Design a protein around this ligand. Sequence first.
Ligand code: NI
Length: 561
Amino acid sequence: VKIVTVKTKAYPDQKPGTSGLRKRVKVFQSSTNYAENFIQSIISTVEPAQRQEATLVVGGDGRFYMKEAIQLIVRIAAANGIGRLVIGQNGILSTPAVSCIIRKIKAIGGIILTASHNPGGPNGDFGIKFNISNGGPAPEAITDKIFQISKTIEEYAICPDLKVDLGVLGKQQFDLENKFKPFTVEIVDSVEAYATMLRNIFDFNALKELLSGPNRLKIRIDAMHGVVGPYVKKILCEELGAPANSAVNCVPLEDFGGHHPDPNLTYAADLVETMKSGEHDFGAAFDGDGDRNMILGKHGFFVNPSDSVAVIAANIFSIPYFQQTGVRGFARSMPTSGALDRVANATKIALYETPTGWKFFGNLMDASKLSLCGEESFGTGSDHIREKDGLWAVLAWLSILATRKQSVEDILKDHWHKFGRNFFTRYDYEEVEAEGATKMMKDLEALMFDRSFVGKQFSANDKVYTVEKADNFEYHDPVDGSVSKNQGLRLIFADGSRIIFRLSGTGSAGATIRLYIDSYEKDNAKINQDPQVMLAPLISIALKVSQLQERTGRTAPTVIT
Ligand code: NI
């Protein structure tokens, strides 16, 4: 194979986010050398002396353009001096599986080709996420270095002629012009190392009894045509014995069947209606790359993401891994509800409240301070890998149903009557006019930081809300030293209720308002009544204090979660 050097002209917009670089498919296939430039920049962060012995893992969610970009990664990694590439069969590898293999075989890191729940196909998105040797996403120091290189790059090395068959398992060796060591590409089964790790975390025998036995839990798992479909089939159906019909949408499609792979009540509607029937005991959906999940009980019973980490926390010792390893700590992002706190308080186990994004969870896990973490945005994880894991959360729930022998509906009722209930809801006000929003935030801040703000009585209907604390949440990471200021406007009431305003805006189009409402309840009787009814006083107070309808006009929210 020959090594060619291509003279390239650098790009200004290739700044990698926390989830790597994402741009619509079109930018990648039209902008000459966009992909090649970025890939050579990722490889360039690996210094020469380390390339021969380095192994990089490559894989993706299977959306359109994935195969063309993997063939580009191979040719540039090969010309650049990287000794070996472990590619998942057909290029398919979920984000939890790539994290698992990097750690397993001690790789330098890996390149994950996914834009998570963002749509796929000719007119959709495409992303290139870079993960490091601990198995987790590359930290700011590394993402900005890639960004410094991309803006000033003049040339990239490539083996144009080299091509590998992604469908054939085993080792492929290639010789590169004048170079003494051959380039090795290893095609690995997409599910095997991942299922082997899960085989030692959970008790696949209790689960084989649960899914196959006389009692047989009837489940419906929707993989929304994304990467976890091969995994559902081989692990839940072939190994655990769930009938073939338990796996819906489990064949990776390039456009995700047109529709977005986003695990929620709106996008996973087809599964929510199939669940409403009553035939199934448990239902579940996952996103494009498998690190997020949605849990459903009989008759469509929505198990809120914030309640879900709390239930797994309140029964964590039902899982063999936690029994043999112990629980180092619990954690959640600040917008997420207080249910995990009520479980954490019942034990001498530490609870961390972190801002939004994996980096916070990853750092504490690497510091051996975190075992189970959750987010209100359909995210659940543990320290078994350094990424969230959607299928791990489903087998953790099936292990709890196996142990308990109760329904999902009953596990949450018994949970709310022990720990009390955190009625949680999230209001999304997608893209608004920035000035009004910043006023709504600034005036609110001023009003929150007052002498008479604290301790005061706010009230409407059922409850009396007294302002115990009020701020703009900031975090000082204990591991990397970072400080993340003004992460969110908090309103904390003395009973346990809370209102959180988060402004996720854009210096490109406008600004998104996110309103999260967490209201605590302890009464045995009010605990089971509907969340929109019970949360109404605080939603009206949130609009009356923020004056959102006043400075932005909008009455109703775009999305309700
Ligand atoms: Ni994802």
